[PDB]
Write a protein that binds this ligand. Structure first.
Ligand SMILES: *[C@@H]1O[C@H](CO)[C@@H](O)[C@H](O)[C@H]1NC(C)=O
Length: 104
């Protein structure tokens, strides 16, 4: 891999909007991981998506939590790897800090 790069977006409506308009640029210096936060209805529909290049300290609170807003949950993940944060986390299992199966 060359450098560090993530899908990035601030408060996009869904994964399509986030990824389709994500700039093809490298991460800011002193970031190493790709972060994703997905606010969704518990029934499934996306409400908001934020994706960022981050340091380690932003990746220590992953999982799906209940929102103060009734009927919403917030799922947060992080990953290591070039543009690794293409998907969205939707459940506790995938709302985690992990690598990918690109290279077995
Ligand atoms: C995962 O999230 C979806 C969101 O629609 C939900 O339907 C499902 O109950 C959740 N849990 C599991 C174990 O899949």
């Amino acid at each position: 891999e060359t450098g560090f790069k993530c899908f990035t977006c601030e408060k996009a409506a869904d994964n399509y909007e986030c990824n389709r308009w994500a700039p093809d640029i490298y991460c800011p210096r002193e970031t190493r991981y790709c972060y994703t936060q997905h606010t969704m209805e518990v029934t499934g529909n996306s409400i908001s998506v934020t994706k960022r290049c981050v340091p380690l300290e932003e990746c220590l609170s992953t999982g799906c939590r209940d929102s103060e807003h009734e009927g919403h949950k917030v799922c947060t993940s992080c990953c290591e790897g070039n543009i690794c944060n293409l998907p969205l986390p939707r459940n506790e299992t995938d709302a985690t800090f992990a690598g990918t199966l690109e290279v077995l």
